[model samples]
Target chain A: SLNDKDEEIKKLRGFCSRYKRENASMKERIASCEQGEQENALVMEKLMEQKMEDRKIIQSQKKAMRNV
Target chain B: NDKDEEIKKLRGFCSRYKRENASMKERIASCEQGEQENALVMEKLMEQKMEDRKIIQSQKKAMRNVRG
Candidate 1:
């Protein structure tokens, strides 16, 4: 009867709401991880320049030693 | 009659389902937007990483002139 169909629809509504909650949270997780990845990438870039500068100083000191 | 109550119940369920569908569509749009934003950020970070590598290599070449 129609009552049976109504019961089924009621259950389906509960299922849909749970899925909606999970979907929202998953999207938030992805965004948060993406933000963290960007921060790490920026840190690496900052270090890379400093690393190269240090190597140049070291090379110049070694050349000075050779000329002595 | 029992049929009248059942029809009312079914109609109420249909109304709720419509509202839920509307909210879900909005969430899906937001999810897609977040994904696009993440993609662009990742692209920029990767480009920055590669540029850092290029700078490091160029510094190495320039330092080779040091006669040590």
Candidate 2:
């Protein structure tokens, strides 16, 4: 009953399709998003995954900010 | 082909379950975070309302001072 498919491929497609992340655009956008917490969250969540990558990012930022 | 069909069905189900599990987990964490934020916001609103009452009280006191 191959009536359905798992959406993993679909989701991966949405991400990897952008391919701009593999380039430099995403890095510049991520850095530029720090205008405010909400703006940061929009980029952090949309560009960087909120559940996984963004948590790592905000934590790292907090730690780095503490050190400097 | 019956086995193939059944295998595909099972595979689809396993993948679906995995995806659903992740969203379910995210929701659990999201709700926990949301509840904490709700607590903070509700407490803040209550405090703000209470503070407004004090301002009103102070205004009344100032009026009595001027009247006296």
- How close is each model in CA RMSD to the real structure? 6.8, 18.0
Residue A68's lDDT in candidate 1: 50
Q: Record all residue pairs in model 1 with backbone atoms less than 3 Å apart, i.e. clashing.
A: none
Q: Tens digits of per-residue lDDT for model 2 on A10-67?
A: 4444444344243345334333432333443353344323234434544554455455
Q: Write the residue-wise lDDT of candidate 2 on B1-68 in tens digits.
A: 66455455555655655565555556555555655565565555556555555655565565556558
- In model 2, which runs have C-alpha deviations exceeding 4 angstroms? A1-68, B65-68
Candidate 1 residues A20-64, lDDT tens each?
676667567656766765675676666666556655765665575
Candidate 1 residue A28 Cα shift, in angstroms, is: 13
lDDT of 1 by residue, B1-68 (tens): 56556556666765666676666667666666766675676667567666655765665565565533
**In model 2, what is chain B's TM-score?**
0.61
Residue A67 error for model 1, in Å? 14
